[PDB]
Enzyme design. Structure first.
Site, PDB file in Angstrom:
ATOM      1  CB  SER A  52       1.731  -5.899   4.074  1.00  0.00           C
ATOM      2  OG  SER A  52       1.938  -5.171   5.262  1.00  0.00           O
ATOM      3  CB  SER A 102      -1.030   0.018   1.130  1.00  0.00           C
ATOM      4  OG  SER A 102      -2.185  -0.724   0.766  1.00  0.00           O
ATOM      5  CE  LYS A 129      -1.316   3.725   2.967  1.00  0.00           C
ATOM      6  NZ  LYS A 129      -1.302   2.501   3.835  1.00  0.00           N
ATOM      7  CD  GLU A 157      -3.685   6.171   6.175  1.00  0.00           C
ATOM      8  OE1 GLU A 157      -3.405   5.731   7.309  1.00  0.00           O
ATOM      9  OE2 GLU A 157      -4.145   5.453   5.260  1.00  0.00           O
ATOM     10  CE  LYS A 177      -3.897   1.347  -1.332  1.00  0.00           C
ATOM     11  NZ  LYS A 177      -4.552   0.779  -0.134  1.00  0.00           N
ATOM     12  CE1 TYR A 197      -6.595   0.591   1.498  1.00  0.00           C
ATOM     13  CE2 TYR A 197      -7.004  -1.258   2.977  1.00  0.00           C
ATOM     14  CZ  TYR A 197      -6.367  -0.725   1.871  1.00  0.00           C
ATOM     15  OH  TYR A 197      -5.520  -1.517   1.128  1.00  0.00           O
TER      16      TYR A 197
END
Length: 361
Positions: free
Chosen positions: A318, A64, A315, A272, A67, A150
């Site tokens: 995995s 992730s 962030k 985030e 992103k 999410y």
């Protein structure tokens, strides 16, 4: 607290070694940004059977964390004037005629607030015709801009639509507009044959594994990179004033802007954030899947708040055989990258990172 290079090396080793033994991690590449430069530390094996060690050249799967690249690429497109977060999703996909899409903006796709898009795009989707069928059939459980859930089906679509006006496929747009300008020449979606010798092996239940296809996989979790490129990626994000590309520096700022508040956290594009100073238990207790996968109410930030220097920006990421994490505090200009070839608990990743950065603040 001015920590020397020698003390920094000790702080990292004393934290990483016990972590790897407790979590059975085969290998790990770490990078700490301190006093304007990256510091590298490598541990363990990239390939246990072949007995290859982890080096600053070893490639790991980002999961992730891919992103954050999507968010910045989207931010760059906005800064170029190609798209607007306020535009309806249908402006970029005319064939999406379902009336349930009215009121859903590009912003909602990017920040998981469309109204209940599921975590993943179903396996049935094997082409563009079926991709459309899926989004046309989807029925929102909540009104847009009220609930954060999410989802890869959400941000993945944002990434695919954000690059349409440019006329370039996602991979080509990412390379030309983000990777190349930043000199990230060892960051891939598709690892070339010449580079496969650097590709680490992931491990799951003792089994050596590596990522496989999908649809919006590149936009959601398909990036592979080494610790050197990752350190530079973090440096560009914590100090965008130093990047020359005008739209790219604004895109970096847009990805770290605050669009919604969910309890103690704020949602950016990919990234985030939490206000600094913040205690470890707040950040650690927030990384649990029970809370990370839940549908939570959101508080709109309007207009979106520009990047706040006093922030804990991070962030997690995995894959079947990899576990990585990135965190940085702009006000202090310190950051860390931890790439590993085994997916161990997120709270464990957060705890270790917080411990190291705490010694540098």
């Amino acid at each position: 607290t001015p920590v020397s290079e020698k003390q920094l090396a000790e702080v990292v080793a004393n934290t990483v070694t016990p972590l790897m033994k407790a979590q059975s991690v085969p290998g790990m590449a770490v990078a700490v940004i301190y006093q304007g430069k990256p510091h590298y530390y490598t541990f363990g094996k990239a390939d246990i059977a072949a007995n290859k060690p982890v080096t600053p050249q070893t490639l790991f799967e980002l999961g992730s964390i891919s992103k954050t690249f999507t968010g910045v690429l989207g931010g760059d497109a906005i800064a170029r004037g190609e798209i607007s977060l306020d535009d309806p999703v249908t402006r970029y996909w005319p064939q999406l005629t379902g009336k349930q899409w009215q009121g859903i903006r590009m912003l909602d796709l990017a920040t998981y607030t469309a109204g209940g898009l599921p975590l993943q795009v179903p396996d049935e989707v094997t082409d563009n015709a079926s991709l459309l069928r899926f989004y046309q059939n989807w029925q929102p459980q909540w009104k847009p801009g009220t609930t954060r859930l999410y989802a890869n089906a959400s941000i993945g679509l944002f990434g695919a639509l954000a690059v349409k006006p440019s006329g370039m496929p996602y991979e080509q747009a990412m390379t030309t507009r983000v990777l190349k300008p930043l000199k990230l020449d060892h960051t891939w979606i598709n690892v070339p044959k010449a580079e496969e010798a650097h590709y680490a092996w992931g491990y799951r239940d003792g089994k050596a594994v590596r990522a496989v296809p999908g649809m919006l996989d590149a936009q959601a979790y398909g990036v592979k990179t080494n610790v050197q490129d990752m350190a530079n990626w973090v440096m560009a994000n914590m100090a965008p004033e130093n990047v020359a590309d005008a739209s790219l520096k604004q895109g970096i700022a847009l990805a770290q802007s605050r669009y919604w508040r969910i309890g103690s956290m704020y949602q950016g594009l990919g990234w985030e954030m939490l206000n600094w100073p913040v205690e470890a238990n707040t950040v650690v207790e927030g990384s649990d899947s029970k809370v990370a996968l839940a549908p939570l109410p959101v508080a709109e930030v309007n207009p979106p708040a520009p990047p706040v220097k006093a922030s804990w920006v991070h962030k997690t990421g995995s894959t079947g055989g990899f576990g990585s994490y990135v965190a940085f505090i702009p006000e202090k200009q310190i950051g860390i990258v931890m790439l590993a070839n085994t997916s161990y608990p997120n709270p464990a990743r957060v705890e270790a990172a917080y411990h190291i950065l705490e010694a540098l603040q």
